[PDB]
């Protein structure tokens, strides 16, 4: 299929700046390129089709150019409603293929956020199959760098836990992490307290959520 490479990937700007976004195609696509705008919780909206023809209702500050391979979207004097995600779309060849997208975001928006920490004990259903999983969730934090230490009876755990992180949220631009401590039921029985210690720059000192078996 035809691959469209957008540049840049992200762009932090302020109200009133001039912004240019490029889209390069793997092969010639003629005038069959359009620019789309996507806001959080909504589908991409067509802004410009035919490389340069503005859709009815699109403000004059939006403009497009290029022909063949290299294409450019230009937003002169950004408005508060222009901050969204922008995609280039080709309908020259089947299948229709989008670009990677360009996130145009406010500059004063990536504020530090402390993670809300929650700890989940293993369910009674899982215990009757020989295994026991303890889950610790770090919800809505920025930046992405966080430390999750597993403690059981104040003993540090290692090599028996797995982490997974969500990508940057589209609405609040925060991160979320989940850690799973996997033990056998016999080893889960020989211990009482189960704690999850979280180190993040939004906290004054590590936050520990724990429970008793």
């Amino acid at each position: 299929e035809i691959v469209l490479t957008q540049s840049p990937s992200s762009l932090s700007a302020s109200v009133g700046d001039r912004v240019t976004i490029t889209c390069r195609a793997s092969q010639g696509i003629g005038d069959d390129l359009g620019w789309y705008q996507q806001k959080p919780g909504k589908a991409p909206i067509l802004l410009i089709y035919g490389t340069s023809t503005l859709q009815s209702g699109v403000p004059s500050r939006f403009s497009g150019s290029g022909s063949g391979t290299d294409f450019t979207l230009t937003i002169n004097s950004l408005q508060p409603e222009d901050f969204a995600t922008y995609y280039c779309l080709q309908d020259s060849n089947y299948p229709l293929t989008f670009g990677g997208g360009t996130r145009l975001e406010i500059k004063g928006g990536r504020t530090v956020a402390a993670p809300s920490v929650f700890i989940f004990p293993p369910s009674d259903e899982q215990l009757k199959s020989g295994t026991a999983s303890v889950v610790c969730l770090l919800n809505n934090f920025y930046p992405r760098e966080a430390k999750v230490q597993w403690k059981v009876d104040n003993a540090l755990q290692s090599g028996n836990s797995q982490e997974s992180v969500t990508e940057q949220d589209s609405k609040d631009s925060t991160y979320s992490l989940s850690s799973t401590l996997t033990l056998s039921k016999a080893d889960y029985e020989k211990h009482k307290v189960y704690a999850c210690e979280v180190t993040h720059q939004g906290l004054s000192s590590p936050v520990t959520k724990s429970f008793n078996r």
């Binding site: 299929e1 020259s92 369910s123 199959s129 989940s178």
Partner: protein, 214 residues
């Protein structure tokens, strides 16, 4: 009147061979380069073989190089594809077509190819495992958190909704992790008064589990 009818598909054990045929009519068959196209489950169209109008040149995809052989008889209006050492990735619906990958068409060319012929390589279910769904609730307003643990399934993927798709705000469905056993595990969480039920869908095992979290 233009017609291209595929035949020869069926079930075949891995490592063994199978031959597909294509009958052509309604056009000057010896004046068109012929292709074999296929579509595997969850994947887009894949052009695996091409033979020139006269049969001199034969190009193959790297996916099938050294295992597949395309040929044609311009006196019988027939096209053939000899598939040897068949693997699980060869399980797909196979089409006989005149248009290549770089044809330039803006419309789905598969729409003009009919049903094609189906090749099913057996054994694509021995490693399939269905998931087990476990609740996630803290040990004793909108400040709490619940979730579901989707554990011990294979292969990918698993998708999760909440309250039959009615709940959307606050849901975080984490990418699945790979366990030491070779099976996958996924966690989905939500951050009240209403009930909370996760709906887990694992199509490789045709698993649909509704698990309410208490």
């Amino acid at each position: 009147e233009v017609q291209l009818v595929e035949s020869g598909g069926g079930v075949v054990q891995p490592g063994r061979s199978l031959r597909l045929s294509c009958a052509a009519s309604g056009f000057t068959f010896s004046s068109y380069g012929m292709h074999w196209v296929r579509q595997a489950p969850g994947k887009e169209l894949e052009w695996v073989a091409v033979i020139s109008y006269d049969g001199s040149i034969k190009y193959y995809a790297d996916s099938v190089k050294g295992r597949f052989t395309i040929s044609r008889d311009n006196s019988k209006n027939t096209l053939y594809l000899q598939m040897n050492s068949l693997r699980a990735e060869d399980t797909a619906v196979y089409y006989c077509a005149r248009t290549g990958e770089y044809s330039g068409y803006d419309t789905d060319p598969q729409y003009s190819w009919g049903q094609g012929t189906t090749v099913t390589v057996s054994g694509g279910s021995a490693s399939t495992k269905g998931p087990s769904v476990f609740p996630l609730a803290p040990c004793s307003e909108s400040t709490a958190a619940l979730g579901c643990l989707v554990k011990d399934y294979f292969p990918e993927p698993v998708t999760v909704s909440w309250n039959s798709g009615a709940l959307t705000s606050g849901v975080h469905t984490f990418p699945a992790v790979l366990q030491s056993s070779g099976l996958y595990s996924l966690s989905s969480v939500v951050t009240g008064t209403k009930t909370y039920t996760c709906n887990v869908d694992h199509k490789p095992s045709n698993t649909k589990v509704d698990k309410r979290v208490h």
